[PDB]
Amino acid sequence: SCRKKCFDASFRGLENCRCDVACKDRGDCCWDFEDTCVESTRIWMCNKFRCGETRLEASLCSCSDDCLQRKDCCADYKSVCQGETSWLEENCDTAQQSQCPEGFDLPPVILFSMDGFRAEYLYTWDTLMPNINKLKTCGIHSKYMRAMYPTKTFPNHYTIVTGLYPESHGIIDNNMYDVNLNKNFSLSSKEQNNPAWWHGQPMWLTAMYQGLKAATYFWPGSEVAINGSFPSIYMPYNGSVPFEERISTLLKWLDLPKAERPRFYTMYFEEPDSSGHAGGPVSARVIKALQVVDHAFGMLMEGLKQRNLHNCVNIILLADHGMDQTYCNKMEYMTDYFPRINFFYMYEGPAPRIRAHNIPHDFFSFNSEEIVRNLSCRKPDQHFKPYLTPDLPKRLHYAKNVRIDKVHLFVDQQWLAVRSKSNTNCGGGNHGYNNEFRSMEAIFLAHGPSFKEKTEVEPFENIEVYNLMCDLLRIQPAPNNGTHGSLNHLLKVPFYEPSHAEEVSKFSVCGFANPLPTESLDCFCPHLQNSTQLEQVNQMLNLTQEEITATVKVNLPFGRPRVLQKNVDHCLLYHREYVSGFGKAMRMPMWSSYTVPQLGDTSPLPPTVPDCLRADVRVPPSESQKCSFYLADKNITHGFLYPPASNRTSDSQYDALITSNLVPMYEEFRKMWDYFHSVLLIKHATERNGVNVVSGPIFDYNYDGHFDAPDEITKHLANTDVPIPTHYFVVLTSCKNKSHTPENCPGWLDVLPFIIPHRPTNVESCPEGKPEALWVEERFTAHIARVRDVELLTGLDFYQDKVQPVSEILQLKTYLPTF
Numbered sequence: 097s098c099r100k101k102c103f104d105a106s107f108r109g110l111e112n113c114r115c116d117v118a119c120k121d122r123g124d125c126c127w128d129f130e131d132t133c134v135e136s137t138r139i140w141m142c143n144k145f146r147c148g149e150t151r152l153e154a155s156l157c158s159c160s161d162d163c164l165q166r167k168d169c170c171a172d173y174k175s176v177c178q179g180e181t182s183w184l185e186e187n188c189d190t191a192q193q194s195q196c197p198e199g200f201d202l203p204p205v206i207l208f209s210m211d212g213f214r215a216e217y218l219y220t221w222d223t224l225m226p227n228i229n230k231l232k233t234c235g236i237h238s239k240y241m242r243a244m245y246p247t248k249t250f251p252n253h254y255t256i257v258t259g260l261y262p263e264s265h266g267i268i269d270n271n272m273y274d275v276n277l278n279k280n281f282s283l284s285s286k287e288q289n290n291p292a293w294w295h296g297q298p299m300w301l302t303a304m305y306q307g308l309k310a311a312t313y314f315w316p317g318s319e320v321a322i323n324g325s326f327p328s329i330y331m332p333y334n335g336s337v338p339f340e341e342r343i344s345t346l347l348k349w350l351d352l353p354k355a356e357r358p359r360f361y362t363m364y365f366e367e368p369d370s371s372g373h374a375g376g377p378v379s380a381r382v383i384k385a386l387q388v389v390d391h392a393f394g395m396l397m398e399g400l401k402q403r404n405l406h407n408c409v410n411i412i413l414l415a416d417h418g419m420d421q422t423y424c425n426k427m428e429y430m431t432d433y434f435p436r437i438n439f440f441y442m443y444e445g446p447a448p449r450i451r452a453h454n455i456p457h458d459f460f461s462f463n464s465e466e467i468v469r470n471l472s473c474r475k476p477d478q479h480f481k482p483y484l485t486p487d488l489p490k491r492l493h494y495a496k497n498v499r500i501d502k503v504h505l506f507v508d509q510q511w512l513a514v515r516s517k518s519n520t521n522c523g524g525g526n527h528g529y530n531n532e533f534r535s536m537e538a539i540f541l542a543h544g545p546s547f548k549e550k551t552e553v554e555p556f557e558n559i560e561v562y563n564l565m566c567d568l569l570r571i572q573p574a575p576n577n578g579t580h581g582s583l584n585h586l587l588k589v590p591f592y593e594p595s596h597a598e599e600v601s602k603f604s605v606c607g608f609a610n611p612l613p614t615e616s617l618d619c620f621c622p623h624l625q626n627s628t629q630l631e632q633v634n635q636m637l638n639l640t641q642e643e644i645t646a647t648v649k650v651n652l653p654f655g656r657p658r659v660l661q662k663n664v665d666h667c668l669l670y671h672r673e674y675v676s677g678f679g680k681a682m683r684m685p686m687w688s689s690y691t692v693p694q695l696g697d698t699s700p701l702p703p704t705v706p707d708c709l710r711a712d713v714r715v716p717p718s719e720s721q722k723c724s725f726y727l728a729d730k731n732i733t734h735g736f737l738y739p740p741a742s743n744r745t746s747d748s749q750y751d752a753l754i755t756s757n758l759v760p761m762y763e764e765f766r767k768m769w770d771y772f773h774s775v776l777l778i779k780h781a782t783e784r785n786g787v788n789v790v791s792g793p794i795f796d797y798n799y800d801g802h803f804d805a806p807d808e809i810t811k812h813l814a815n816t817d818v819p820i821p822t823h824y825f826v827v828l829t830s831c832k833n834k835s836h837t838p839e840n841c842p843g844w845l846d847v848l849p850f851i852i853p854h855r856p857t858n859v860e861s862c863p864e865g866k867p868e869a870l871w872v873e874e875r876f877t878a879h880i881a882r883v884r885d886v887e888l889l890t891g892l893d894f895y896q897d898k899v900q901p902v903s904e905i906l907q908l909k910t911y912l913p914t915f
């Protein structure tokens with residue numbers, strides 16, 4: 097045979113069999129020549145033909161008797177050649193600091209991304225991916241990780257390592273135009289390397305700035321001098337480098353002397369994304385790619401075990417987004433809606449945008465309003481909805497950036513919107529859609545001495561990973577949009593312990609001093625004829641200390657919302673059936689909290705009594721609204737935050753027909769608002785065994801996701817300083833265990849937050865004369881959000897008096913209900 101005699105022309109084996117290059121032409125090569133001498137230089141694995149081999153120059157890794165000393169063994173050398181158990185076959189054993197070799201005092205972090213790894217892959221094809229499946233079994237894994245919108249590669253890869261929404265880190269799509277720079281960004285141009293596009297601080301720099309070297313293998317942004325700095329080590333991108341070579345480089349880095357060894361690593365694979373596009377998410381090509389990437393990841397784990405690092409490394413395996421199926425018969429065309437399309441440019445596909453064709457000249461003069469108008473409610477079954485970006489659901493956080501064109505189209509599942517029928521980028525797989533579509537969900541797995549073992553966690557958003565990685569490396573994170581501490585339940589010993597945010601503006605008292613108003617405020621309730629009758633009704637607002645305690649216990653079961661705005665004067669208004677926090681400068685509530693019990697009759701609430709409003713004797717007139725403000729303002733009317741018709745006693749509706757419960761509402765919005773509180777709210781209450789409601793106004797006129805300062809609000813009621821909300825929020829809170837009511841809930845809570853836009857038409861719902869039962873609920877559902885989103889937009893902090901660990905409350909606050 098040719099063992100240890102490769103290419104030796106002098107050798108003559110059994111029957112004079114040859115082991116030289118020219119042997120294959122003669123036909124007298126020994127039987128094992130091809131496997132011992134030729135193929136042994138083109139593979140990354142040891143086998144029976146290679147173990148103990150003589151070294152050859154051109155081998156990608158070695159199986160020689162000295163490969164461990166030279167630190168060039170193939171990953172599987174110890175298992176294949178020395179007969180030791182592989183990582184794959186070893187049982188799940190606990191990862192701890194004892195399993196770190198000398199010098200690995202701090203465990204390194206490996207951030208590993210497999211582009212386009214749909215969450216559903218991990219469960220349908222689990223046994224086809226033994227190495228990933230073992231990671232899933234031994235380590236911690238999430239049901240899925242939610243990406244950011246648009247579900248694209250560069251925006252989401254950069255979100256992962258920054259903890260920032262795309263609107264903040266600047267990479268809002270794989271293709272974009274910046275009118276200020278007057279430049280184009282695309283993955284085929286060198287402009288992608290311009291640091292002007294990349295904001296925030298990526299993870300490798302967070303580590304490097306705090307003394308920890310970072311090595312990146314192909315992460316989007318890693319070959320950019322972000323903030324003027326490259327990673328300690330980085331590789332120029334080339335999609336042709338085999339996955340095995342990338343893993344091999346990573347293992348070599350881990351062999352470096354401690355003085356030079358990185359402590360933060362990133363790895364990136366283009367699969368299963370590439371095969372998903374070619375064959376679709378359910379296809380032979382995807383199956384093959386999933387097997388490829390599982391093998392490459394297995395190579396990494398075997399190589400780590402060879403080095404005694406498999407239980408020392410904190411590894412994270414995730415993806416940037418999922419994958420769905422497109423169809424050429426599921427395409428919308430702009431030619432069907434515009435006779436002339438020459439004058440605008442369109443970023444086509446699952447998350448399209450439209451801008452002026454002649455840029456930069458016409459970028460701002462472009463009438464984005466006309467585009468969205470002319471695309472709204474054109475066909476009853478059209479498979480996309482146009483939006484001006486400030487009108488997009490606020491949970492997407494996709495508007496505050498000049499690179500995000502004002503015209504947006506929100507496209508239905510498995511559909512595409514293109515310019516004309518000349519576009520043929522259809523038929524395969526694609527992504528970019530609503531990050532809530534199950535097809536768009538990504539995987540998240542993790543394993544290491546700092547993570548919990550054999551644990552499944554609930555879904556979370558990829559903006560949270562950045563804080564987690566900083567906690568793993570024990571460094572401080574840059575300001576980001578994660579909620580630091582919401583992923584502590586993944587860690588054995590959290591590095592950061594969160595606390596309640598202390599209130600910034602203390603409340604004052606609006607006492608019940610005089611039962612008769614000093615001013616009528618131009619409000620009329622002729623049903624109340626003489627002062628005596630008025631005095632009786634107003635006395636109902638004058639609660640004993642025992643009655644205040646009683647209404648708080650029921651209607652504020654988790655404590656009052658705390659105000660984190662500075663220099664905001666507010667007082668609480670106590671009623672038997674609701675408790676509000678009244679903003680004196682706004683002259684309206686910042687929040688109103690009431691608990692709706694489960695009732696025997698699911699009857700719809702009749703309308704509020706029409707012609708009866710009066711001043712609130714507890715609030716001075718300078719801080720109260722006047723009913724004449726709304727008569728004076730022709731474009732808006734008044735609505736109620738707490739629904740008066742929900743009174744549970746024969747006269748308690750008077751408690752809600754007061755100026756302190758009024759908020760400015762467009763007529764058309766109030767129809768939607770009233771239908772929700774009259775019909776849908778009662779269904780929620782009976783489904784959840786009662787529900788606690790906290791609602792209030794939101795002002796975000798600069799659509800940056802944060803509560804506006806007074807001087808940022810650009811619309812007011814009549815000629816007053818009473819601001820007009822851009823949104824209203826409604827947060828439904830009940831007991832996760834439906835056996836308890838919201839008041840008597842010792843365990844976990846369950847939340848359903850709404851941030852409904854306050855718009856003067858319901859064009860977003862295309863009601864076309866239909867009854868509210870056919871579109872209101874759909875519209876609220878489309879505007880669900882996280883409590884955290886409500887907090888950011890209001891300056892309020894909820895649930896501080898709910899006895900429960902802070903980190904668990906943060907899980908509740910970052911939760912997104914999905915449908």
Ligand SMILES: *[C@@H]1O[C@H](CO[C@@H]2O[C@@H](C)[C@@H](O)[C@@H](O)[C@@H]2O)[C@@H](O[C@@H]2O[C@H](CO)[C@@H](O[C@@H]3O[C@H](CO)[C@@H](O)[C@H](O[C@H]4O[C@H](CO)[C@@H](O)[C@H](O)[C@@H]4O)[C@@H]3O)[C@H](O)[C@H]2NC(C)=O)[C@H](O)[C@H]1NC(C)=O
Nearest residue numbers: 623702703704705708741742743744745746747748749750
């Ligand atoms: C929640 O509150 C509503 C509204 O209450 C009404 O408005 C408040 C602002 C305040 O002025 C209250 O004093 C006032 O009642 C309650 O709904 C009302 O309920 C009453 C009965 O309790 C209804 O009264 C009936 O109205 C009919 C009009 O269609 C009228 O024909 C009836 O007349 C007959 O009955 C009376 C005795 O009740 C008798 O004297 C007459 O001669 C005749 O036989 C009767 O007046 C109101 O219509 C209701 N209004 C609305 C809008 O629904 C509701 O009961 C309350 N909820 C709870 C749980 O207490």
Ligand SMILES: *[C@@H]1O[C@H](CO)[C@@H](O[C@@H]2O[C@H](CO)[C@@H](O[C@@H]3O[C@H](CO[C@H]4O[C@H](CO)[C@@H](O)[C@H](O)[C@@H]4O)[C@@H](O)[C@H](O)[C@@H]3O)[C@H](O)[C@H]2NC(C)=O)[C@H](O)[C@H]1NC(C)=O
Nearest residue numbers: 607608609610611612631634635636637638639640641713
């Ligand atoms: C809001 O509702 C309250 C009921 O919960 C009303 O309370 C009434 O207030 C009047 C005026 O203060 C009292 O009449 C006076 O009583 C004092 C005696 O004061 C001592 O006792 C009272 C009652 O416990 C208490 O408020 C004091 O702290 C003292 O301990 C006499 O000296 C006066 O001459 C006068 O008669 C009522 O007794 C009181 N009723 C009740 C049931 O508390 C209050 O008036 C309402 N507010 C408004 C603005 O109308």
Ligand SMILES: *[C@@H]1O[C@H](CO)[C@@H](O[C@@H]2O[C@H](CO)[C@@H](O[C@@H]3O[C@H](CO)[C@@H](O)[C@H](O)[C@@H]3O)[C@H](O)[C@H]2NC(C)=O)[C@H](O)[C@H]1NC(C)=O
Nearest residue numbers: 294295296297298299300301302305322323324325574575
């Ligand atoms: C981009 O890179 C620059 C460095 O080239 C970063 O600036 C550096 O920021 C740190 C912390 O913000 C500065 O250190 C601090 O200095 C202050 C004042 O002396 C002190 O109070 C702190 O204890 C700390 O030492 C550092 O001086 C500064 N360097 C320079 C040259 O400005 C910058 O933060 C990076 N930006 C992003 C977004 O990554």
Ligand SMILES: *[C@@H]1O[C@H](CO)[C@@H](O[C@@H]2O[C@H](CO)[C@@H](O[C@@H]3O[C@H](CO)[C@@H](O)[C@H](O)[C@@H]3O)[C@H](O)[C@H]2NC(C)=O)[C@H](O)[C@H]1NC(C)=O
Nearest residue numbers: 260261264265295296297493574575576577800801802888
């Ligand atoms: C997500 O997190 C980022 C980073 O914390 C938030 O962006 C930050 O927003 C603040 C205020 O909007 C910016 O500070 C402001 O800067 C301007 C000019 O630079 C200054 O005039 C203001 O007085 C204020 O200091 C900050 O620059 C910005 N940081 C980055 C990296 O963009 C963002 O708001 C968060 N998003 C949500 C929805 O919470």
Ligand SMILES: *[C@@H]1O[C@H](CO[C@@H]2O[C@@H](C)[C@@H](O)[C@@H](O)[C@@H]2O)[C@@H](O[C@@H]2O[C@H](CO)[C@@H](O)[C@H](O)[C@H]2NC(C)=O)[C@H](O)[C@H]1NC(C)=O
Nearest residue numbers: 155156331332333334335336337338339340341342344345
């Ligand atoms: C992108 O990579 C491919 C694949 O080879 C890689 O790059 C080589 C330069 C080397 O570093 C290998 O270890 C990598 O795996 C390159 O294509 C090959 O390049 C080699 C030159 O070393 C050549 O002999 C092969 O014929 C090339 N094969 C093909 C299909 O081109 C390619 O050059 C790289 N592109 C860029 C722009 O660097």
Ligand SMILES: *[C@@H]1O[C@H](CO[C@@H]2O[C@@H](C)[C@@H](O)[C@@H](O)[C@@H]2O)[C@@H](O[C@@H]2O[C@H](CO)[C@@H](O)[C@H](O)[C@H]2NC(C)=O)[C@H](O)[C@H]1NC(C)=O
Nearest residue numbers: 433434435436437439440463466467469470471472473474
């Ligand atoms: C945007 O639409 C207006 C109005 O057109 C109507 O509404 C559209 C949504 C569509 O359903 C049309 O069929 C409707 O007629 C356009 O203004 C009209 O333009 C046409 C042709 O130029 C003209 O005959 C009408 O008189 C115009 N009507 C009005 C009220 O101005 C407008 O041109 C459209 N803009 C673009 C860029 O297509």
Ligand SMILES: *[C@@H]1O[C@H](CO[C@@H]2O[C@@H](C)[C@@H](O)[C@@H](O)[C@@H]2O)[C@@H](O[C@@H]2O[C@H](CO)[C@@H](O)[C@H](O)[C@H]2NC(C)=O)[C@H](O)[C@H]1NC(C)=O
Nearest residue numbers: 784785830831832833834835836837840841842843844845
């Ligand atoms: C959800 O809660 C119900 C109700 O439990 C009640 O509250 C307890 C604090 C205590 O006061 C019990 O007496 C009450 O029944 C749970 O249902 C009960 O479960 C226990 C088992 O621990 C059983 O002994 C009771 O008979 C059950 N009662 C009823 C009416 O079914 C229920 O188990 C909780 N759900 C979960 C997932 O824990």
Ligand SMILES: *[C@@H]1O[C@H](CO)[C@@H](O[C@@H]2O[C@H](CO)[C@@H](O)[C@H](O)[C@H]2NC(C)=O)[C@H](O)[C@H]1NC(C)=O
Nearest residue numbers: 273277278279280281441442453454455456457
């Ligand atoms: C960015 O890319 C767009 C392509 O969409 C370029 O658009 C051209 O803009 C000029 C005006 O400067 C027009 O005269 C051309 O007709 C446009 N071409 C197309 C195909 O639309 C734009 O020029 C690019 N800008 C930069 C700075 O490269």
Ligand SMILES: *[C@@H]1O[C@H](CO)[C@@H](O)[C@H](O)[C@H]1NC(C)=O
Nearest residue numbers: 624625626627628629630631
């Ligand atoms: C107020 O009107 C009612 C009418 O029912 C009656 O009590 C009386 O006329 C008035 N009360 C007083 C105290 O003047």
Ligand SMILES: [Ca+2]
Nearest residue numbers: 796802803804
């Ligand atoms: Ca704002």
Ligand code: NA
Nearest residue numbers: 726727729732
């Ligand atoms: Na009006």
Ligand SMILES: [Zn+2]
Nearest residue numbers: 211212249416
């Ligand atoms: Zn991708």
Ligand SMILES: [Zn+2]
Nearest residue numbers: 212369373527
């Ligand atoms: Zn892709």
